[PDB]
Design an enzyme around this catalytic site. Structure first.
Site: not given
Lengths: 337, 270, 270, 337
Positions: D155, D38, D153, D113, D171, D43, D188, D158
């Site tokens: 990071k 999320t 974005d 992950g 994302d 999410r 971010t 992501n």
């Protein structure tokens, strides 16, 4: 004269200590107004005496909760000590009583708030300001110690500022009469002496250690030992290594190295000359000890207070009812209260 | 940030000092000792307290997938891993995440040995494993009972001393608080003739031999030596040597006078 | 700790750049300016953006006891105190405490000018007072509209330049991104004859006079000078001086070549 | 050949970009298994294709919430970009569709992950390890940028680690096709370029800045700009002053001073030689760029995965239902989706 004064406080204390007060009021004589404080153990309630209109700070302890924590004697110590002592910088016990659920101790209301609040808002106190407060504690410990009482919970949170800007020391939950050595691990993590942490057995010297932590915290705005994990705070305390802020005066630093002394053969308060090593110390050169005791000195800070029963100097807590069960609880455990 | 959060009071269970042996292999006992040596609460313990503490640690077996402890679940227990793999998991808002793991070694919950401390993590076995556990109440008692014993009396060593017979009770306790301990192996020189007289000694166990430039004294349990340091700061008149393995109480005379004043003063009372 | 907390994404309201004047005394305007000068979002603004921003700040009167803002109550507004006393209060677990106060000055909520930011404190007036407020949407538009305007065109200054006529669109925008600005007062020496040729200049406003060891040029809005720095690194052939108050665009030639390569290269295309 | 490769990706992208996919599946074709993530916006849900038994990561956006936030085009950008791009290090869009309440984007499931999890557990990555990942981003940005796409974005949160230990960037909420300059403040906080913070208008250079923040965070275990208050982080970013850890190699430091450059006339990625200033930089001397692209290099880390649909590499979130209203919401706002 300090001798002849103390020889006499002792006389008076022993007389009240021998035969304690019991059930000198009851709950329905007071109106609950507002919660003044909560903590690891019971809370404190502004109350109004229905008849006299007088305000008091009423401490409330739940018998079942005390029993579960094994805090029973602490509660009996606190009550029995409070009704027997008498000193200008100690909050006075007016009434005590119990019911089916609770123990109650009704103290005089001190409206100035906790030193913690003021300290945190200003940041830190100037040395003369911190010195004013320290002098009161020094004299309070001298008085308590001459009766074989130790306090064990010194911290800004527990010092209340009165209408004159003088200190009233308040919560006697951990106070105890010790003629020898005692063993309970209690206090507040930041303020624990090495010997409490390591279970070595200990008496008066832990209060003088805590005085060093307090003074350091007043002058600096934060305590000398701090960290992420509590175990880490203890490690620092036991190393007893301390860093001073660049703004600390040399006399302040000299005093704090003598108070924050891990080695008991060197800790001020614990040596041949006792408390006089602290009173005659130079950071205290400009202190008039009799004048402080007589509250003739001029406070560096007077609290703003409007009408009686005003609570603006205190934080706001979740208000919970005082529940009194129809069943009496732990009646025997608390028979002496 | 949060400088306005009050510091809460803490308090362990009352215990007034005025049996449990869980068997373990020699190796288990060595590894257990080595895991506890840098932990604050263990690291200063004397050999006899350590030994009783290790004696008292209980075996906890865990099956794969078993929760050894649960987050927020009371901290009255400290744990050292004997064997096995474990995952460390914390739930925060929010969200549950694996934050790390142990591989056949590690320990957690030491703060619980001081006062009640709900665990900050859930620890799960990822294989069959075992741990050594220790309660807080069990630990406290061992430590407190033992220290109360080493006092009251340690003195009665102290009070059998001719120079110190006029000490008042409170003054004797001040000396008990700080008196140190020293160990020697057979034939070590405890005191050298001609050296500075810094302290006096009481034999706790073993045998000390006093000699002089010639055997003039033999010292057994409860006997003092070097006691002239208390009344005169002249060089040592005699040497002292350990016969066998010797344990002595040792008191520095400067520290003594800081606490109490000159010994002769105490000896010229009544 | 809390290294396992993810960093959340942030995002302001869309505004595609391709009126509000709240009157205030001169003094109110000076104090407002002085309060905003070290705030990140204001401190780099040029005089014209600052002026429009101050123009747009609205008056908020408060009565004693009034909540100026409430904790957790959306941050779309920044506030500067014009007058009055205020208490700052935060509720944390827990517990509500007064954490500080303002006395006739102070500001709060600047993060709200970037994206929605619920306030961390409740602020209460303890006397009659007033504040200057500023929305985030109002602020953004002023800044974005103005910059989009200073671009598109700033060039068209740039594209009227003979040496730069063969620049492609994207390359021209790279120059627009970084081209600097300089201000001069009447009679200041912009360029000295014989000096290193470090950059070229475009007059935005005012009048520049070119002279040589003798008036050889007069430079008005949209005209370039010092442009030989782009094609040769010889010393300046002429001096340049501001006539009146002059604002120039200024481009360093080294920076230019870092972005684009040598200018002559661009001039030898098609 | 990089030219002739990129000239061709462009050809392929423009063809799909011109005519987009619509409603290529529907909710009842999937079983919801578990929430995978999320964030500030919708999410992600592990789902199982009822028929094929294939697993996917399905992104879910609530139309009303997007509308309230004024995120409408971001949502249309994300979908329209994802269906047109194609690169080895980009997570693939399999299906997209909408209903009365939600927009849905069904991606391939990457089971390894987030790099964030692994990075936080290990602490930090060795330079060759960090270099492996950086090289993939460098090539992904080269590919995206040649199509006038910016990502916005970057990071660790992501970047997903696949079965081979290669990166899958995921994302595309903030991704956008910009031929000129754009103005939305998004990303971010830790990763925002100065020009985004100060609303100067900006294109490709913000991604290269963010690459510098990422690399720095991989090698050090924490980002270069951090503080109590976000406004404080921005102040540091805009000063652009950066401290390196004593263990950073000189070549790493040299690269990060060129990426974390506040001055756009000096930022790597933005100069005459474009991305080649980074590829030919020495921290990348030992990088085989074609070999990385072909996934022929050997990953420094392979995730542990049991059976398909295993979620042990992901955190655990509060499971909330996917609510589908009987009333269609914001139908016009999302007609293009």
């Amino acid at each position: 004269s300090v001798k002849e004064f103390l020889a006499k406080a002792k006389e008076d204390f022993l007389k009240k200590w021998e035969t304690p007060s019991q059930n000198t009021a009851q709950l329905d004589q007071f109106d609950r107004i507002k919660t003044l404080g909560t903590g690891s153990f019971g809370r404190v309630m502004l109350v109004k005496h229905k008849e006299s209109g007088n305000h008091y700070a009423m401490k409330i302890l739940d018998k079942q909760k005390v029993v579960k924590l094994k805090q029973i004697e602490h509660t009996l110590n606190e009550k029995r000590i409070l009704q027997a002592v008498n000193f200008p910088f100690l909050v006075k016990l007016e009434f005590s009583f119990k019911d089916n659920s609770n123990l109650y101790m009704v103290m005089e209301y001190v409206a100035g708030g906790e030193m913690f609040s003021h300290l945190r808002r200003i940041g830190r106190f100037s040395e003369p300001h911190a010195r004013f407060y320290a002098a009161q504690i020094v004299l309070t410990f001298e008085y308590l110690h001459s009766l074989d009482l130790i306090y064990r919970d010194l911290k800004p949170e527990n010092l209340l500022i009165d209408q004159q800007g003088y200190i009233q020391v308040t919560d006697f939950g951990f106070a105890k009469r010790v003629k020898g050595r005692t063993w309970t691990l209690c206090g507040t993590p930041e303020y624990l002496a090495p010997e409490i942490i390591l279970s070595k057995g200990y008496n008066k010297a832990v209060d003088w250690w805590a005085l060093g932590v307090l003074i350091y915290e007043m002058a600096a705005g934060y305590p000398p030992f701090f960290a992420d994990q509590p175990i880490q705070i203890y490690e620092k305390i036991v190393s007893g290594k301390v860093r001073f802020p660049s703004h600390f005066s040399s006399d302040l630093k000299d005093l704090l190295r003598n108070l924050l002394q891990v080695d008991l053969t060197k800790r001020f308060g614990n040596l041949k000359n006792g408390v006089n090593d602290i009173k005659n110390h130079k950071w205290f050169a400009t202190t008039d000890w009799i004048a402080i005791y007589q509250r003739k000195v001029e406070a560096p800070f007077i609290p703003k207070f409007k009408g009686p029963g005003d609570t603006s100097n205190f934080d706001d807590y979740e208000e919970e009812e005082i529940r009194v069960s129809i069943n009496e609880k732990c009646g025997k455990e608390f028979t002496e209260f | 940030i949060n400088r306005f959060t009050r510091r809460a009071s803490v308090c362990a269970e009352a215990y007034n000092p005025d049996r449990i042996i869980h068997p373990k292999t020699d190796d288990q006992r060595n590894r257990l000792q080595e895991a506890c040596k840098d932990i604050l609460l263990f690291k200063n313990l004397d050999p006899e307290q350590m030994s009783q503490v290790l004696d008292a640690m209980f075996e906890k077996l865990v099956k794969e997938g078993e929760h050894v402890i649960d987050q927020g679940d009371d901290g009255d227990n400290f744990y050292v891993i004997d064997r096995g793999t474990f995952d460390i998991y914390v739930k925060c808002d929010g969200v549950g995440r694996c934050v790390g793991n142990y591989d056949n070694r590690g320990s957690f919950g030491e703060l619980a040995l001081m006062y009640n401390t709900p665990k900050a993590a859930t620890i799960t076995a990822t294989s069959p494993g075992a741990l050594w556990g220790l309660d807080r109440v069990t630990f406290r008692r061992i430590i407190v009972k033992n220290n109360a014993k080493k006092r009251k009396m340690y003195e009665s060593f102290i009070e059998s001393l001719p120079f110190l017979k006029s000490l008042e009770v409170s003054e004797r306790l001040k000396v008990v608080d700080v008196i140190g301990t020293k160990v020697y192996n057979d034939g070590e020189q405890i005191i050298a003739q001609g050296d500075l007289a810094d302290s006096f000694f009481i034999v706790e166990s073993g045998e000390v031999k006093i000699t002089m430039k010639v055997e003039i004294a033999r010292c057994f349990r409860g006997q003092y030596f070097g006691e002239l340091a208390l009344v005169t700061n002249k060089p040592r008149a005699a040497s002292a040597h350990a016969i066998g393995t010797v344990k002595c109480l040792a008191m520095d005379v400067q520290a003594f006078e800081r606490l109490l004043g000159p010994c002769m003063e105490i000896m010229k009372r009544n």
